[PDB]
Amino acid sequence: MVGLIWAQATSGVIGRGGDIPWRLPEDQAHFREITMGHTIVMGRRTWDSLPAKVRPLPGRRNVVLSRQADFMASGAEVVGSLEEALTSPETWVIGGGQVYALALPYATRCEVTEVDIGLPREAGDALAPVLDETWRGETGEWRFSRSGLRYRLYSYHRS
Ligand SMILES: NC(=O)C1=CN([C@@H]2O[C@H](COP(=O)(O)OP(=O)(O)OC[C@H]3O[C@@H](n4cnc5c(N)ncnc54)[C@H](OP(=O)(O)O)[C@@H]3O)[C@@H](O)[C@H]2O)C=CC1
Numbered sequence: 629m630v631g632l633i634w635a636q637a638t639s640g641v642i643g644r645g646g647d648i649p650w651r652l653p654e655d656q657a658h659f660r661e662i663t664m665g666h667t668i669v670m671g672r673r674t675w676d677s678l679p680a681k682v683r684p685l686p687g688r689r690n691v692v693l694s695r696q697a698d699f700m701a702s703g704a705e706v707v708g709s710l711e712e713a714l715t716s717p718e719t720w721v722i723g724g725g726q727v728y729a730l731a732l733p734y735a736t737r738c739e740v741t742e743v744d745i746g747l748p749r750e751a752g753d754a755l756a757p758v759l760d761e762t763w764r765g766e767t768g769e770w771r772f773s774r775s776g777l778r779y780r781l782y783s784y785h786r787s
């Protein structure tokens with residue numbers, strides 16, 4: 629089982645300038661709840677994006693995908709291919725617009741957070757993968773974050 633998890637603006641933007649372009653404090657706990665105790669896979673840039681005090685993410689086996697055989701990632705496992713990263717029975721791909729695209733075909737689950745923020749795509753932004761009709765989903769109820777942004781959770785699956 630390979631699952632993807634991300635938070636996106638309605639527009640599909642998930643990253644800009646190397647950061648997540650919004651504040652949603654409730655996201656951290658939902659992300660934790662889903663990923664805790666599992667192996668997590670991320671692209672090198674997502675690893676770099678993680679604050680130094682929080683990486684590697686605690687309670688999870690951190691796997692970082694990189695083309696540099698010499699890449700240094702303390703507390704994480706650096707691999708050079710997707711096949712080497714997906715060996716666990718339950719793996720969660722936590723990032724990179726690139727890595728989500730790469731891992732989507734191996735996936736049978738997607739946990740998505742839609743952020744109701746006006747943020748049109750700009751050239752160079754990290755974008756979420758598009759889910760075609762092979763996916764079946766359930767949309768949760770919109771809620772208000774204390775940051776003032778409205779958001780909702782989606783759960784998709786396919787066999
Ligand atoms: N909103 C959300 O939920 C999330 C948003 N993000 C955002 O996403 C952005 C980063 O996304 P993005 O720029 O696409 O980067 P990625 O995180 O996907 O990392 C891309 C890197 O992964 C490695 N890589 C990619 N493909 C391969 C491959 N086929 N084989 C081996 N290594 C590979 C390379 O590392 P190298 O160059 O070292 O070889 C490449 O530069 C940031 O802005 C981040 O904040 C991240 C996570 C969640």
Ligand SMILES: COc1cc(Cc2cnc(N)nc2N)cc(OC)c1OC
Pocket residue numbers: 633634635647648655656659674677678679682721722723741
């Ligand atoms: C928990 O800390 C982070 C987690 C993530 C990945 C991530 C965060 N939220 C969601 N919903 N899906 C994800 N894959 C990405 C981050 O920065 C890009 C983080 O630092 C803020």
